[PDB]
Design a binder for this molecule. Structure first.
Ligand code: HEM
Ligand code: HEM
Lengths: 145, 145
């Protein structure tokens, strides 16, 4: 249940998400591409899903990958901005969930983004505490897949 | 090209876009839904394209319409944030262009959004000067359709 998942976002979790986002969200192009390249490096079996982006190994030099990465960061921005109202958070999550359901992405495969997020956070000096907070937000999307 | 259309956006136009967005973008749920409902009210022929959203006459109550409307405002947020770097504005514009190309939305049809944008701007007392600035930004997307 996406509603039960959203209920797991306690005051402390919401605070950790906001505090860490203030840093990671400050460079959407840089961190967005970092997230994607890490996903492809640690989970090469997911590359096939991104056929439209072309050669993803080119990273930042790939115009389609850069546009996608920046856009992805705005989806995360949308989640953070909706933390105050669970009903609005849910409708935004379900919108993006549909984008992945049509792509045949399961809850388990979507969860593969947790590794990259933990690594990007760590590179900015945000440890397991923050990684776990983000895993709970990702869990809300998983509940809708 | 799309690059040419973006590189032409002048300092004065960027200023008007940013000043008006400070206001219209401060209530994404409210103004996003207003934009969509105005589109359906003045251009009833477009309703059929949004069948995935269900009964759009339900307005704010329709969670799918609310989710779509909020997310649409973040696409505009992405455009505004990239105004000073045409290279980044272009790759983001092309990303959202593909979303509409797949739905068979023509450049002319995309331009139907100008009416609703003008009305929403007017509700906040932003005149023709601002409506003209937004039409120029919309034209950047049209260059990609
Ligand atoms: C933090 C989690 C993630 C967020 C917020 C996110 C967000 C997005 C957004 C906003 C889009 C564009 C939707 C569209 O225009 O169609 C997208 C596309 C896509 N996503 Fe994700 N995504 C995430 C994780 C994943 C993961 C882990 C996978 C794969 C295992 C995945 C697979 C896809 C695919 C295949 C596309 C289509 C790309 C294309 O052809 O343009 N996403 N995602
Ligand atoms: C300011 C201009 C507009 C922006 C920024 C915009 C943005 C978006 C975004 C972000 C999506 C979601 C993409 C996806 O998840 O696949 C979308 C979907 C769509 N847009 Fe637009 N759009 C605009 C104008 C229009 C206009 C004027 C039309 C048609 C006359 C249109 C028709 C569509 C359709 C049919 C969809 C698919 C909805 C669905 O089934 O979920 N858009 N748009």
């Amino acid at each position: 249940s996406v509603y039960d998942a959203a209920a797991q976002l306690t005051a402390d979790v919401k605070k950790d998400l906001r505090d860490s986002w203030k840093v990671i969200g400050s460079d959407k192009k840089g961190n967005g591409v970092a997230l994607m390249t890490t996903l492809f490096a640690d989970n090469q079996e997911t590359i096939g899903y991104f056929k439209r982006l072309g050669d993803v190994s080119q990273g930042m030099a790939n115009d389609k990958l850069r546009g996608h990465s920046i856009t992805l960061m705005y989806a995360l921005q949308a989640f953070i901005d909706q933390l105050d109202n669970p009903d609005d958070l849910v409708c935004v999550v379900e919108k993006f969930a549909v984008n992945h359901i049509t792509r045949k992405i399961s809850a388990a495969e979507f969860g593969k983004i947790n590794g990259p997020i933990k690594k990007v956070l760590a590179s900015k000096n945000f440890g397991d505490k923050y990684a776990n907070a983000w895993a709970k937000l990702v869990a809300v999307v998983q509940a809708a897949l």
